[PDB]
Amino acid sequence: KVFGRCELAAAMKRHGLDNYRGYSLGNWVCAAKFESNFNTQATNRNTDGSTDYGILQINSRWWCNDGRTPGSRNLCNIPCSALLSSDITASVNCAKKIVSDGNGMNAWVAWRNRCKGTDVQAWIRGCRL
Ligand SMILES: [Cl-]
Ligand SMILES: [Cl-]
Ligand code: NA
């Protein structure tokens, strides 16, 4: 599923991301835009052989099991394919564990480089929430 901007904002608010660990909703929408272009089916292979999955590009070296990242962890206890569903619940629940691990949203390189320090409220401007 390719989400619209305000559609995704509303889904993320419903799932408890607005102000989660202090990050306003626009931060999460901005991260999803630059990580996946709002596409739940996005995948990208990394140099070390791990793969990133879904609307928030969650990495198989630490967070999910894809059966092909030797020596990796599965800290969200899910198959990585669950992160590609049109229902974003699994992605959001895993993202909450990632953002709570001490590094905050700096875990998402696109957030650090394209959202951090910008006017992120612009990402939810005009939406009915
Ligand atoms: Cl915001
Ligand atoms: Cl933080
Ligand atoms: Na893994």
Query: What residues does each domain of the chain span?
Result: 1-129
- Of 7, 52, 87, 119, catalytic: 52
Tell me the CA–centroid distance for residue 61 and ligand 3, in Å: 5
CATH class of 1-129: mainly alpha
Q: What are the tokens at 33?
A: 């835009």
Q: What angle do CA 2, 92, 54 make, to 5 degrees?
A: 40
Q: What are the tokens at 31?
A: 């991260």
Largest alpha-carbon pair distance within the chain?
A: 45
CA–CA separation, 79 vs 99, rounded Å?
19
Instruction: Name the phi and psi angles at 121, rounded to 5.
Output: -60, -20
Asked if residue 104 lies in contact with residue 111, where contact means CB atoms within 8 angstroms, the answer is: no
Number of neighbouring beta carbons within 10 Å of residue 10: 17
Asked if residue 7 lies in contact with residue 121, where contact means CB atoms within 8 angstroms, the answer is: no
Asked if residue 18 lies in contact with residue 24, where contact means CB atoms within 8 angstroms, the answer is: yes
Is 79 buried (19+), middle (13-18) or exposed (0-12) by CB count in 10 A? middle
Residue 79's nearest CA partner among 67, 69, 93, 97 is 67
Nearest ligand (C-alpha, residue 69) = 3
Tell me the H-state helices in 38-114: 89-99, 109-114
Instruction: Name the phi and psi angles at 54, rounded to 5.
Output: 90, -170
Tell me the H-state helices in 1-129: 5-14, 25-36, 89-99, 109-114
Is 12 buried (19+), middle (13-18) or exposed (0-12) by CB count in 10 A? buried
Determination technique for this entry: X-ray
Binding residue per annotation — 87? no
* Resolution reading in Å: 1.6
Q: Return the H-helix or E-strand segment holding 44.
A: strand 43-45
66 is catalytic: no
Residue 62's nearest CA partner among 18, 14, 107, 124 is 107
Nearest ligand (C-alpha, residue 99) = 2
Tell me the CA–centroid distance for residue 50 and ligand 3, in Å: 8
**3-class DSSP state of 59:** strand
7 is catalytic: no
For residues 49, 54, 59, 64, the Cα torsion angle rounded to the nearest 10 degrees is -100
